[PDB]
């Protein structure tokens, strides 16, 4: 049930397992987060050329067809954003983390992990004394409890023997043979079977202190794991923001403007030249 | 191929139905944007609903579990945002344009619509004075043409008579008239040939102002569409921006400070006092 409970310091030795583990899911769920980002920019330029090419081939000309590609231009440069969004977060951000396991976990041949091995091997080592006393403790009570479960077995027994009506002359002596035999038991069993308590007793204080000394080791180990992840999260927070950005305000001060470019009259005026009363004439 | 020569007006009556098919592919083109955004912000729910059950099924725990959890959040926040933009793409600038196409143009029961028949018609009226004309002259460029092709032949054919011999008396008094009329057409069709070029010329000033006035008509009506296209670009481009809005940054705003709310050392107390040496124990007793 608990942390001293012999064999119980196996859900720290776990938690390192469980670091590596965590390690390949941040990994993936941000593998993941650039995957989405890479989508999102493919559909935009595609958009982009889709539309680009049919505002192009279309009825579409002069300035408003300009102010018009300007769109596309936005889903372009919209689409770099986003596309070293995933860049950053694969490249530098992963891979980060790809080598922090590298470093922090060595995979053994057998066999699990260099690291897990160690602290099982340390928690083991410390608990070995103390497991081996208990080993003999345990004896000491069970037996003896067997002992007084057998001092009370001829004490009602008598009793309830005395009662009978036959075989008292030596059969007498026997009844009163085997109630204190069993007083010499609960006295002598009790007494190292309470002396081993205490030996226990002797060999705690280091037992104790030997946990402590791998357990604080198990813990720096994994102290150095959090600090990396919110070092990290911290670093992927920036790569994904894009809510204050000035490469990203210039895409939209630059297609307003185009749009502003928009001249409905200019437009008129070449229509009236290239294909109205303003076209030259061969008058008969 | 000159705008003036006739027909050639029908270049600017197929404006105008190429103006409402701009109209149509302007809401296609937005609505393909649409529709992006909502499959980005989509993918965004997606994964933050995906991770969000595996960073808490998983064996992180306390306040690194939750400074990767607000990530989730932000993947959410932005979705949300992505879909404004949608929203507003098909609420008001896809609709904006379909309602002015509506009004703009109307379609007739027999074909086309009302004002690019409207239009041709204005045309026409406009240039059948001078077209009719103009089909005068055509003749006479024919005939007078035919008149002196006629004329060379008969020369040709009293000159190639020249050297040949009889017969005949009476075949020559033929074939001396010939000439003569020939001589007499190409003084006579070409005072109609003459007459019609001038005749066209005081119905000619006449005509380029019936053009105009038509012409105006229809820049009138294309000066409509092209400053409708420009105000709805500049709603459009209002809508996709993102670069600058309040509920954006608050999305950073939040995920930075969640992320700074972890905290290594608490994390390790808790453990120790929950599963650790922190944890008391039941020691033997008798
Ligand atoms: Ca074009
Ligand atoms: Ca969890």
Same mark, same amino acid.
């Given at each position: 049930d608990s942390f001293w409970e012999v064999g119980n310091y196996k859900r720290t030795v776990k938690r390192i397992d469980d670091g590596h583990r965590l390690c390949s899911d941040l990994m993936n769920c941000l593998h993941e987060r650039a995957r989405i980002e890479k989508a999102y920019a493919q559909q935009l330029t595609e958009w982009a050329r889709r539309w680009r090419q049919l505002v192009e081939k279309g009825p579409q000309y002069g300035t408003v067809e300009k102010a018009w590609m300007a769109f596309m231009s936005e889903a372009e440069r919209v689409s770099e954003l986003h596309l070293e969004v995933k860049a950053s977060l694969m490249n530098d951000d992963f891979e980060k983390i790809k080598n922090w396991q590298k470093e922090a976990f060595h995979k053994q041949?057998? *066999? *699990?992990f260099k690291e897990t091995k160690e602290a099982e091997d340390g928690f083991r080592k410390a608990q070995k004394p103390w497991a081996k006393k208990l080993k003999e403790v345990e004896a000491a009570k069970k037996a003896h409890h067997a002992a007084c479960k057998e001092e009370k077995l001829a004490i009602s027994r008598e009793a309830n023997s005395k009662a009978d009506?036959?075989?008292?002359?030596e059969q007498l002596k026997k009844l009163q043979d085997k109630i204190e035999k069993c007083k010499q038991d609960v006295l002598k069993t009790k007494e190292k079977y309470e002396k081993s308590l205490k030996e226990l007793d002797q060999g705690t204080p280091q037992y104790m202190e030997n946990m402590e000394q791998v357990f604080e080791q198990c813990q720096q180990f994994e102290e150095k794991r959090l600090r990396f992840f919110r070092e990290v999260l911290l670093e992927v927070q920036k790569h994904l923001d894009?809510?204050?950005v000035a490469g990203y305000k210039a895409i939209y001060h630059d297609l307003e403007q185009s749009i502003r470019a928009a001249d409905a009259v200019e437009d008129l005026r070449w229509f009236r030249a290239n294909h109205g009363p303003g076209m030259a004439m061969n008058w008969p």
């Open positions: 041949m057998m *066999g *699990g009506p036959s075989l008292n002359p894009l809510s204050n």
